[PDB]
């Protein structure tokens, strides 16, 4: 089974958002769809469930005022009057005994800040050479850095983003055998979906 979920959303305080869950690989009608909330470093909170054969819906009291479950093979969930306390990952999931399937979740950022694309800077300087790319000044979070379109994955280190003046900044490093660089070029790819950005940087001495 597979439950396709958005990925990320940036919304202004007070606004309303509608997340979607696309169910496949099984009879949508056969199971009750669930929704769970996870804030960055904390545990999980249950929100509610809905029955696809009809639309009977149960919710946790804490989210009685925030969520409105509906369906279609897409299950939907709408939050409302958003605040920074709503900044979290939301998962739709079939939670029933051995039928346990989760979606990848949708990272929801409630903020007034403007979407800003990253600036990517190449970091070039034994038997191995550690190269890197500095990705700075972007918003919102969610950036993927791959090396050689992802074919170079063994020695890659991805360092989590940090806020530096209201903007995020992170880095990634790759280590290759010394004899292979600069002979062969390694290039880091940076994708920032929120701002439709895909910039490649070739590492040169």
């Amino acid at each position: 089974v597979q439950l396709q979920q958005s990925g990320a959303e940036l919304v202004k305080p007070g606004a309303s958002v509608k997340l979607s869950c696309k169910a496949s690989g099984y009879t949508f009608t056969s199971y009750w769809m669930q929704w769970v909330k996870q804030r960055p470093g904390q545990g999980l909170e249950w929100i509610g469930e809905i029955d696809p054969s009809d639309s009977y819906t149960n919710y946790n009291q804490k989210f009685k005022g925030k969520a409105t479950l509906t369906v279609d093979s897409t299950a939907y969930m709408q939050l409302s009057s958003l605040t920074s306390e709503d900044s979290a990952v939301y998962y739709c999931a079939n939670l029933r005994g051995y039928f346990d399937y989760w979606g990848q979740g949708t990272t929801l950022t409630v903020s007034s800040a403007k979407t800003t694309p990253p600036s990517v800077y190449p970091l070039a300087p034994g038997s191995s050479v550690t190269l890197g790319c500095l990705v700075k000044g972007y918003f919102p979070e969610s950036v993927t850095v791959t090396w050689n379109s992802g074919s170079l994955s063994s020695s890659v280190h991805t360092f989590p983003a940090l806020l530096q003046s209201g903007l995020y900044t992170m880095s990634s490093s790759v280590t290759v055998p010394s004899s292979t660089w600069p002979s062969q070029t390694v290039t880091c790819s940076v994708a920032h979906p929120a701002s439709s950005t895909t910039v490649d940087k070739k590492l040169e001495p």
């Binding site: 999980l44 890197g132 360092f159």
Partner: protein, 216 residues
């Protein structure tokens, strides 16, 4: 709401060893229908939780028998018979006997391994960044253990405290080591006024600080 409390919050364990994770509920998880809906999930960083054990001791598809669940009423145990590098992550116990469904705080499995000194790399600001007036000088402190390390930036011998940004990765799922990147941020002007930029790290493995430097 039934409150679930896990013990402990962090669990350091060597490869090949055994791990026991506990979970208590404020009240009995035995449904009137006879079943006890207590479950266990593993959440690997950047991934959705995945089910291991449902109804105390039955395993989900594909989960190996190194994982077993036990317990009753309000006390429950998740046992990992021989810890393997890929077991790291956070374990959550969850109940669905009562409504609403509820989850535990989580327990992070930490792998104990042999000490490893960090391999340090220093990098000067790229011309592209200089070109725009910024000047970040970065330091990668890779593959070390334990996670406790200390980094200092020195400019011409002077220790720079402000303008530094540090971020550690989570334990490596393949070699159980940690990594960290320390970034010193200056303007193009301040940077061009000095000569040597030093990245110093003090970690259990040396006594004498590990020092990487470059003279502009």
């Amino acid at each position: 709401d039934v409150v679930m409390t896990q013990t402990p919050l962090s669990l350091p364990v060597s490869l090949g060893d055994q791990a026991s994770i506990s979970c208590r509920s404020s009240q009995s998880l035995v449904h009137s229908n006879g079943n006890t809906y207590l479950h266990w999930y593993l959440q690997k960083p950047g991934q959705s939780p995945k089910l291991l054990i449902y109804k105390v001791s039955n395993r989900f598809s594909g989960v190996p028998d190194r994982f077993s669940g036990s317990g009753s009423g309000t006390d429950f145990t998740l046992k990992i018979s021989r810890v393997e590098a890929e077991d790291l992550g956070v374990y959550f116990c969850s109940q669905s006997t009562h409504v609403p469904r509820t989850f535990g705080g989580g327990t992070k499995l930490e792998i104990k391994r042999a000490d490893a000194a960090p391999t340090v790399s220093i990098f000067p600001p790229s011309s592209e960044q200089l070109t725009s007036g910024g000047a970040s000088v970065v330091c990668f402190l890779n593959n070390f253990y334990p996670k406790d390390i200390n980094v200092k930036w020195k400019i011409d011998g002077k220790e720079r405290q402000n303008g530094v940004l540090n971020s550690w990765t989570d334990q490596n799922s393949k070699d159980s080591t940690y990594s960290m990147s320390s970034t010193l941020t200056l303007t193009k002007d301040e940077y061009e006024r000095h000569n040597s930029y030093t990245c110093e790290a003090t970690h259990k493995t040396s006594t004498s600080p590990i020092v990487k430097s470059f003279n502009r």
